[PDB]
Amino acid sequence: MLRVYHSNRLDVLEALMEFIVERERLDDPFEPEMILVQSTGMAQWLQMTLSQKFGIAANIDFPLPASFIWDMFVRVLPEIPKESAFNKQSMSWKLMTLLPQLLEREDFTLLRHYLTDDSDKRKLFQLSSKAADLFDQYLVYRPDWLAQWETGHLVEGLGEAQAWQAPLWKALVEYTHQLGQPRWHRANLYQRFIETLESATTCPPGLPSRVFICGISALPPVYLQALQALGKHIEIHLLFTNPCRYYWGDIKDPAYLAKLLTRQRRHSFEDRELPLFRDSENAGQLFNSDGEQDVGNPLLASWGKLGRDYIYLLSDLESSQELDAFVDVTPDNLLHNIQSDILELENRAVAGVNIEEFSRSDNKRPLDPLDSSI
Amino acid sequence: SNWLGEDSSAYTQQAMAAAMQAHRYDLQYQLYTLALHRYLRHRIADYDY
Amino acid sequence: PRPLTVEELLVVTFTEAATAELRGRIRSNIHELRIACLRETTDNPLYERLLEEIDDKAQAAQWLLLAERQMDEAAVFTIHGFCQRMLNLNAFESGMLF
Amino acid sequence: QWEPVLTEWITAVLQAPLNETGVSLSQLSARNKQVEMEFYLPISEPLIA
């Protein structure tokens, strides 16, 4: 049970937040309301609109998604420390000590030539900081490589520099075991979390009743899987603001798009999906290997790469409840014409492929010469 | 936390009452009570002040 | 032997105004060549010769479209802007800070 | 060296008789507290001083 609210503007999604929190209400007054954001301006705007409608908007928490996931980790699973031992600076300070001892090992000749010029610790500090940043990015995005490097294997099909990154990680793990700090971290914690959450009772202790996600268009697949697992027992709402109306994603397999016939529900009435349910499905609208080549608007096709990735990620869940609430716009100005052409996913560019349409120039849309939109 | 009250006699119920008017902290009373009342009327059903 | 891409054509142009003019002229020439290849007719003699030379018009149109979209990171650069990035790239081999 | 002075000052301030009930803050559990709230009061009809 993971409701996803597709829309076009942010005023509509704002009305959906105010309708839900008014229809039901929390029992205990000291229980906060959790809203996930990414910056501060969105939090300020949300507080302003909520307070303007209600009268006051107080005791609302705005944590980062990573901090929310770690809080759910320490709440559900036991004996976890409140903060991880693998911070963004702790790895840098540990590799500062680790690198001189790890040097002279027949695989670190590049680092030896980089380091043994002179030593005011500046080059070592910069190298340690960059290595810590890279390992943090690995921990967030791809944990399988770290899982293999814990044992000491090597993965095939990957480029160079693995021969100096993997023993560095193994020695760092051994060092942080030698100190005595806690062992648990985000690469080997999430699998045990989802395993102990998927098959359990329906009443875990300490979890909140509901949580909203507003103004987020970037989520890793690991966090998406964790949120899908957590949404089975508590009610979670997802707000995604996509410009297009129909499905504008990619494809994986000649039978995957047959599975893509999931049913989007209108917010009150019935079901909608992209038109031409089988000819546009199997035909050249979707390409054989990659995504759509005849996307529609060239502006959308050239600018919405991240949106395509995000809608491809959210178009793959199994327990979600995909419902939409859109609003139409009328073409009267230049800006409204462009927005309507983007939303409807249609092409309105004159190329001039043949002599007759190249000669006649009375098929475009007329423009008011007193317009001042763009 | 405030100025160097070097003697404990400079923090009595008269000295603090004088400093309350001398620093105009009395507005915080009504502002904060109104703010908390407007939150209780939204959270607790059947609320009596 | 093989067709290259936009980000694998190094040009070391003398001055910054010349770099800007070269970028603009290359972008305009690519756009006009793509339009002429789509329409299959043109008036410029070199564009006519190129269109007669090319066999696969649709594949040429796709390549020029991808090149035009990729043009916001093209390498029409100077010697200092080239050496700086090569040093900051192979800092391990060159011995530099970050 | 401020440690012995502060470690008794904290215990002194944590055990005051505030309002004849709910006094001596050490008898407050974690379920009954909420620290660092933040509010917002929209006002129309411009406030004459």
XYZ file of C-alpha atoms in Angstrom:
570
model
C 0.000 0.000 0.000
C 2.096 2.859 -1.422
C -0.075 5.551 -2.983
C 1.576 7.535 -5.784
C -0.133 10.808 -6.737
C 0.716 11.870 -10.276
C -0.166 15.458 -11.168
C 0.907 18.397 -13.336
C 1.031 21.426 -11.012
C 1.846 21.831 -7.328
C -1.378 23.561 -6.249
C -3.347 20.353 -6.861
C -0.923 18.245 -4.810
C -1.077 20.893 -2.088
C -4.863 20.446 -1.882
C -4.395 16.682 -1.520
C -2.145 17.188 1.512
C -4.658 19.486 3.211
C -7.596 17.178 2.482
C -5.984 14.078 4.017
C -4.697 15.744 7.197
C -8.139 17.307 7.764
C -10.176 14.151 7.090
C -8.281 12.080 9.663
C -6.212 13.287 12.616
C -3.484 12.016 14.913
C -4.454 11.076 18.457
C -1.461 12.036 20.591
C -0.647 15.769 20.357
C 3.095 15.253 20.910
C 3.481 12.934 17.903
C 5.166 14.913 15.082
C 4.256 14.852 11.380
C 7.056 13.662 9.115
C 7.545 15.251 5.687
C 10.532 14.385 3.490
C 12.145 17.233 1.538
C 15.476 18.108 -0.083
C 16.016 21.872 0.393
C 14.808 24.685 2.659
C 12.683 26.762 0.280
C 10.265 23.871 -0.198
C 9.954 23.514 3.585
C 9.291 27.249 3.952
C 6.654 27.207 1.195
C 4.950 24.136 2.681
C 4.837 25.737 6.131
C 3.469 28.998 4.694
C 0.645 27.341 2.742
C -0.314 24.943 5.553
C -0.328 27.723 8.155
C -2.260 30.050 5.834
C -5.008 27.485 5.320
C -5.262 26.102 8.856
C -4.378 28.935 11.227
C -1.120 27.439 12.470
C 1.367 24.844 11.200
C 3.531 23.765 14.133
C 5.545 20.699 15.199
C 6.435 19.395 11.746
C 9.722 17.625 11.020
C 11.634 17.889 7.725
C 14.383 15.242 7.627
C 16.546 14.194 4.693
C 15.645 10.814 3.110
C 18.931 9.208 4.202
C 18.388 10.336 7.797
C 14.805 9.045 7.636
C 16.003 5.637 6.411
C 18.632 5.456 9.163
C 16.023 6.442 11.761
C 13.762 3.642 10.525
C 16.758 1.281 10.720
C 17.501 2.118 14.356
C 13.787 2.083 15.231
C 13.032 -1.331 13.715
C 16.258 -3.309 14.091
C 17.842 -3.652 17.550
C 21.247 -2.669 19.039
C 21.967 -0.298 16.129
C 23.819 2.898 17.152
C 21.953 6.161 16.646
C 24.478 7.245 13.999
C 26.699 5.171 11.742
C 30.435 4.762 12.262
C 31.131 5.301 8.537
C 30.638 9.050 8.211
C 31.799 11.291 5.354
C 34.772 12.577 7.395
C 35.507 9.564 9.605
C 36.617 7.546 6.574
C 38.939 10.403 5.572
C 40.505 10.541 9.036
C 40.879 6.744 9.135
C 42.477 6.520 5.677
C 44.875 9.268 6.806
C 46.377 6.743 9.243
C 45.755 3.697 7.020
C 47.532 4.819 3.811
C 51.213 5.073 4.995
C 51.103 1.563 6.486
C 49.211 0.162 3.474
C 51.815 1.636 1.139
C 54.652 -0.495 -0.308
C 52.439 -3.376 -1.379
C 53.310 -3.832 -5.127
C 49.880 -2.480 -6.156
C 50.308 1.068 -4.794
C 53.141 2.266 -7.042
C 50.995 5.075 -8.472
C 50.206 6.374 -4.985
C 53.870 6.015 -4.003
C 54.934 8.128 -6.985
C 52.191 10.633 -6.142
C 53.152 10.849 -2.461
C 56.935 10.566 -2.139
C 57.675 13.877 -3.904
C 57.372 15.925 -0.698
C 55.244 15.844 2.435
C 53.273 18.650 4.029
C 50.353 16.133 4.212
C 48.463 18.217 1.621
C 48.464 15.605 -1.157
C 47.665 12.840 1.339
C 44.793 14.893 2.781
C 43.292 15.611 -0.644
C 43.630 11.978 -1.759
C 42.020 10.745 1.471
C 39.133 13.214 1.119
C 38.473 12.197 -2.492
C 38.655 8.494 -1.591
C 36.207 8.998 1.288
C 33.800 10.863 -1.008
C 33.978 8.075 -3.595
C 33.378 5.357 -0.993
C 30.404 7.289 0.406
C 28.927 7.486 -3.098
C 29.497 3.735 -3.495
C 27.781 3.089 -0.145
C 24.751 5.112 -1.227
C 24.377 3.831 -4.795
C 25.995 0.389 -5.366
C 26.605 -1.907 -2.370
C 27.256 -5.140 -4.284
C 30.836 -4.121 -5.089
C 31.510 -3.468 -1.402
C 29.896 -6.816 -0.555
C 32.335 -8.592 -2.884
C 35.329 -6.551 -1.692
C 34.554 -7.501 1.919
C 35.503 -11.082 1.050
C 38.211 -9.987 -1.383
C 36.938 -11.069 -4.787
C 37.105 -9.071 -8.015
C 34.176 -8.304 -10.315
C 34.482 -8.829 -14.062
C 33.635 -6.292 -16.741
C 34.759 -3.331 -14.624
C 37.574 -0.920 -15.421
C 40.920 -0.135 -13.802
C 41.765 1.313 -10.314
C 39.856 -1.542 -8.666
C 43.235 -3.064 -7.767
C 43.978 -0.085 -5.503
C 40.436 0.659 -4.305
C 39.380 -2.831 -3.118
C 42.345 -3.581 -0.759
C 41.938 -0.058 0.636
C 38.326 -0.851 1.555
C 39.276 -4.235 3.031
C 42.031 -2.692 5.160
C 39.638 0.054 6.300
C 37.112 -2.585 7.414
C 39.845 -4.473 9.283
C 41.044 -1.233 10.914
C 37.575 -0.185 12.075
C 37.120 -3.696 13.465
C 40.456 -3.381 15.285
C 39.410 -0.143 17.012
C 36.177 -1.627 18.387
C 33.613 0.776 16.920
C 30.265 -0.744 15.827
C 30.319 -2.803 12.652
C 26.874 -2.243 11.100
C 26.532 -0.046 8.023
C 24.227 0.715 5.119
C 25.596 -1.886 2.680
C 24.825 -4.968 4.793
C 22.027 -3.487 6.919
C 19.278 -2.903 4.339
C 19.009 -6.528 3.181
C 18.520 -7.772 6.742
C 16.026 -4.940 7.316
C 13.877 -5.838 4.302
C 14.173 -9.550 5.150
C 12.944 -9.050 8.719
C 10.231 -6.621 7.576
C 8.721 -8.557 4.643
C 7.785 -11.637 6.728
C 6.687 -10.526 10.204
C 3.596 -9.472 12.140
C 1.548 -6.381 11.296
C 2.363 -4.502 14.539
C 5.951 -3.261 14.872
C 6.538 -0.846 17.766
C 7.393 2.850 17.571
C 6.656 3.428 13.873
C 4.704 6.564 12.872
C 1.195 6.434 11.444
C 1.872 8.151 8.112
C 4.524 10.102 6.216
C 4.428 12.324 3.121
C 7.054 12.952 0.443
C 6.818 16.333 -1.305
C 9.063 17.865 -3.956
C 11.410 14.929 -4.563
C 12.450 13.836 -8.056
C 15.594 11.846 -7.202
C 15.537 8.555 -5.292
C 17.974 5.626 -5.485
C 16.506 2.165 -6.187
C 17.677 0.880 -2.788
C 15.717 3.610 -1.000
C 12.753 2.929 -3.290
C 12.818 -0.779 -2.386
C 13.106 0.062 1.317
C 10.140 2.445 1.099
C 8.104 -0.180 -0.771
C 8.889 -2.697 1.977
C 7.973 -0.192 4.696
C 4.731 0.783 2.945
C 3.181 -2.644 3.542
C 2.531 -1.971 7.246
C 2.100 1.836 7.379
C 0.348 4.272 5.047
C 2.803 6.234 2.886
C 2.009 8.887 0.275
C 4.203 9.809 -2.695
C 3.884 13.049 -4.681
C 5.516 13.115 -8.123
C 5.086 16.154 -10.389
C 5.561 15.006 -13.950
C 4.985 17.301 -16.952
C 3.662 14.673 -19.355
C 0.290 12.917 -19.153
C 0.749 9.494 -20.765
C 3.584 7.010 -20.205
C 6.846 8.526 -21.469
C 9.381 6.045 -20.105
C 11.548 3.273 -21.558
C 11.234 -0.456 -22.251
C 13.092 -3.566 -21.136
C 11.651 -6.570 -22.968
C 9.177 -7.449 -25.778
C 6.994 -9.007 -23.054
C 7.672 -6.412 -20.337
C 5.417 -3.871 -22.048
C 2.661 -6.492 -22.018
C 3.112 -6.500 -18.234
C 3.060 -2.649 -18.304
C -0.733 -2.670 -18.752
C -1.224 -1.747 -15.077
C -4.345 0.250 -14.344
C -4.045 3.913 -13.385
C -7.088 5.070 -11.430
C -8.707 8.498 -11.628
C -8.825 10.169 -8.209
C -12.627 9.795 -7.971
C -14.197 8.114 -11.007
C -12.528 5.527 -13.250
C -9.372 4.463 -15.106
C -7.050 6.161 -17.614
C -3.947 5.150 -19.579
C -2.190 6.163 -22.838
C -4.454 6.005 -25.926
C -4.222 3.440 -28.739
C -3.804 0.627 -26.244
C -2.256 -2.011 -28.543
C -1.100 -0.397 -31.812
C 0.849 2.341 -30.034
C 1.974 -0.284 -27.507
C 3.574 -2.786 -29.876
C 4.317 -0.411 -32.765
C 7.165 2.019 -33.382
C 6.207 4.288 -30.478
C 8.284 1.953 -28.310
C 11.566 0.849 -29.852
C 12.812 -2.763 -29.847
C 15.791 -2.264 -27.505
C 15.931 1.231 -25.972
C 13.196 3.686 -25.008
C 10.876 5.650 -27.259
C 12.337 7.380 -30.299
C 9.080 9.096 -31.325
C 8.590 10.554 -27.825
C 6.552 13.551 -28.903
C 7.732 17.054 -28.065
C 11.437 17.476 -28.965
C 11.847 19.701 -25.895
C 10.641 16.874 -23.643
C 12.681 14.262 -25.519
C 15.850 16.358 -25.225
C 15.410 17.575 -21.633
C 13.656 14.909 -19.552
C 16.361 12.265 -19.033
C 16.119 12.310 -15.232
C 12.324 12.319 -15.447
C 12.449 9.286 -17.737
C 14.677 7.435 -15.260
C 12.423 8.331 -12.318
C 9.197 7.309 -14.064
C 10.877 4.073 -15.178
C 11.792 3.379 -11.546
C 8.279 4.104 -10.251
C 6.672 2.164 -13.128
C 8.125 -1.111 -11.801
C 6.745 -1.524 -8.264
C 4.245 -4.279 -7.476
C 2.313 -3.228 -4.342
C 1.830 0.438 -5.273
C -1.525 2.124 -5.967
C -0.953 4.361 -8.994
C -3.575 7.114 -9.219
C -3.559 10.423 -11.080
C -5.077 13.875 -10.667
C -4.362 16.144 -13.637
C -5.695 19.509 -14.790
C -6.075 20.784 -18.348
C -4.952 24.123 -19.779
C -6.476 26.060 -22.648
C -4.420 27.397 -25.592
C -4.780 31.170 -25.684
C -1.243 32.524 -25.211
C 2.150 31.406 -26.490
C 3.171 30.053 -23.076
C -0.129 28.213 -22.623
C 0.189 26.811 -26.153
C 3.669 25.453 -25.399
C 2.602 24.017 -22.029
C -0.460 22.346 -23.574
C 1.661 20.893 -26.383
C 4.109 19.498 -23.809
C 1.344 18.076 -21.598
C -0.651 16.438 -24.399
C 2.542 14.846 -25.842
C 2.028 15.884 -29.463
C 4.335 17.249 -32.153
C 3.600 20.654 -33.674
C 6.761 21.385 -35.684
C 6.650 22.094 -39.421
C 9.541 20.443 -41.256
C 8.589 20.719 -44.929
C 9.092 17.139 -46.077
C 7.313 17.656 -49.433
C 6.951 20.491 -51.915
C 3.271 21.278 -51.267
C 3.588 21.659 -47.498
C 6.873 23.504 -48.024
C 5.105 25.972 -50.334
C 1.967 26.537 -48.267
C 2.579 28.244 -44.923
C -0.993 28.302 -43.575
C -1.030 25.210 -41.373
C 0.605 26.458 -38.155
C -1.190 28.179 -35.297
C -1.681 31.952 -35.629
C -0.149 34.361 -33.141
C -1.578 37.548 -31.653
C 0.993 40.298 -32.419
C 0.143 41.957 -29.086
C 1.156 38.881 -27.068
C 3.653 39.405 -24.251
C 3.970 35.955 -22.662
C 7.460 34.913 -23.817
C 20.716 33.530 30.852
C 21.493 37.185 31.464
C 23.694 39.812 33.154
C 26.216 39.189 35.944
C 24.046 38.965 39.031
C 27.065 38.750 41.331
C 24.843 38.593 44.437
C 21.921 36.191 44.832
C 19.772 39.087 46.107
C 19.725 40.530 42.555
C 17.431 37.718 41.345
C 14.398 38.182 43.600
C 10.721 38.415 42.653
C 10.963 42.231 42.608
C 14.192 42.513 40.596
C 12.917 40.069 37.966
C 9.549 41.850 37.847
C 11.368 45.146 37.261
C 13.562 43.600 34.550
C 10.455 42.134 32.880
C 9.074 45.626 32.281
C 12.532 47.061 31.562
C 13.132 44.543 28.752
C 9.497 44.229 27.506
C 9.360 40.426 27.697
C 5.615 40.602 28.473
C 4.664 40.357 24.772
C 6.067 36.819 24.577
C 3.427 35.779 27.156
C 0.415 36.553 24.994
C 2.080 35.654 21.683
C 3.205 32.203 22.827
C -0.050 31.423 24.648
C -2.060 32.351 21.545
C 0.253 30.235 19.379
C -0.115 27.193 21.631
C -3.894 27.660 21.939
C -4.314 27.776 18.154
C -2.421 24.461 17.982
C -4.401 22.782 20.768
C -7.706 23.732 19.120
C -6.508 21.876 16.008
C -5.032 18.824 17.749
C -7.203 18.057 20.795
C -10.907 17.624 20.104
C -13.233 19.150 22.735
C -10.581 21.465 24.144
C -11.223 23.785 27.096
C -8.720 26.530 27.901
C 38.127 4.196 -40.449
C 35.188 5.007 -38.153
C 32.798 7.935 -37.608
C 33.766 9.894 -34.501
C 31.580 11.885 -32.096
C 31.370 15.476 -30.844
C 33.484 15.045 -27.694
C 36.370 13.395 -29.606
C 37.285 16.224 -32.017
C 39.871 18.478 -30.387
C 40.373 21.945 -31.873
C 42.940 24.294 -30.303
C 41.719 27.735 -31.359
C 43.875 30.822 -30.708
C 41.615 33.401 -29.020
C 38.342 33.288 -27.099
C 36.369 35.405 -29.582
C 37.530 33.032 -32.311
C 36.383 30.072 -30.182
C 32.927 31.633 -29.787
C 32.651 32.376 -33.513
C 33.839 28.864 -34.416
C 31.269 27.329 -32.050
C 28.474 29.405 -33.567
C 29.479 28.625 -37.148
C 29.772 24.886 -36.435
C 26.347 24.818 -34.749
C 24.714 26.729 -37.616
C 26.357 24.498 -40.237
C 25.199 21.343 -38.425
C 21.622 22.643 -38.170
C 21.511 23.663 -41.837
C 23.038 20.362 -42.981
C 20.484 18.385 -40.957
C 17.619 20.431 -42.432
C 18.993 19.986 -45.965
C 19.463 16.234 -45.468
C 15.875 15.950 -44.226
C 14.493 17.937 -47.162
C 16.872 16.148 -49.637
C 17.398 19.460 -51.519
C 19.603 22.494 -50.902
C 21.175 25.437 -52.738
C 24.691 25.612 -51.290
C 27.152 23.778 -53.603
C 29.109 22.096 -50.795
C 25.875 20.955 -49.147
C 24.731 19.579 -52.508
C 28.029 17.703 -52.893
C 27.799 16.314 -49.348
C 24.169 15.268 -49.859
C 25.178 13.494 -53.070
C 28.020 11.783 -51.191
C 25.882 10.526 -48.271
C 23.868 7.348 -48.925
C 21.811 6.792 -45.737
C 19.809 9.997 -45.301
C 17.890 8.828 -42.216
C 21.040 7.601 -40.465
C 22.798 10.868 -41.328
C 19.840 12.814 -39.916
C 19.997 10.800 -36.685
C 23.752 11.386 -36.345
C 23.432 15.134 -36.956
C 20.537 15.371 -34.475
C 22.593 13.612 -31.794
C 25.580 15.851 -32.575
C 23.475 19.019 -32.314
C 22.051 17.893 -28.971
C 25.552 16.969 -27.765
C 27.004 20.358 -28.873
C 26.676 22.044 -25.347
C 29.896 20.227 -24.331
C 31.913 20.346 -27.586
C 35.695 20.758 -27.481
C 36.550 23.953 -29.357
C 39.111 25.038 -26.763
C 42.452 26.785 -26.198
C 45.867 25.419 -25.235
C 45.649 26.522 -21.586
C 42.110 25.202 -21.156
C 43.307 21.948 -22.704
C 46.448 21.490 -20.590
C 44.617 22.436 -17.375
C 41.981 19.742 -17.819
C 44.525 17.124 -18.898
C 46.569 17.830 -15.756
C 43.470 17.736 -13.533
C 42.479 14.464 -15.216
C 45.806 12.609 -15.033
C 46.811 14.171 -11.704
C 48.179 10.756 -10.657
C 50.630 10.710 -13.562
C 51.354 14.452 -13.461
C 51.731 15.006 -9.704
C 49.192 17.757 -8.989
C 46.767 18.750 -6.257
C 42.990 18.533 -6.633
C 38.231 23.433 35.752
C 34.592 24.570 35.541
C 33.391 20.942 35.903
C 32.823 20.680 39.720
C 30.929 23.983 39.749
C 28.732 23.042 36.765
C 27.993 19.457 37.836
C 26.278 20.677 41.014
C 24.657 23.693 39.337
C 22.874 21.372 36.885
C 21.554 19.223 39.746
C 20.487 22.378 41.592
C 18.528 23.759 38.640
C 17.003 20.372 37.725
C 15.175 20.055 41.067
C 13.154 23.235 41.505
C 9.586 23.453 42.933
C 7.981 25.202 39.950
C 4.179 25.237 40.294
C 3.293 22.876 43.202
C 2.797 20.001 40.686
C 4.911 18.813 37.796
C 7.841 20.250 39.772
C 11.407 18.865 39.909
C 11.807 18.155 36.180
C 13.603 14.820 36.732
C 10.139 13.241 37.204
C 9.253 13.910 33.540
C 9.509 10.985 31.124
C 10.404 11.163 27.425
C 6.786 10.549 26.364
C 5.691 13.853 27.934
C 8.190 16.288 26.365
C 8.603 18.069 23.033
C 11.619 20.338 22.562
C 12.195 23.256 20.150
C 8.816 23.801 18.542
C 8.280 26.253 15.679
C 5.033 27.985 14.727
C 3.520 30.319 12.128
C 0.676 32.810 12.675
C -0.879 34.330 9.528
C -2.335 37.774 10.277
C -4.495 39.874 7.971
C -6.015 43.348 8.652
C -2.689 45.186 9.318
C -1.841 45.266 13.013
C -1.996 48.823 14.353
C 0.543 49.167 17.169
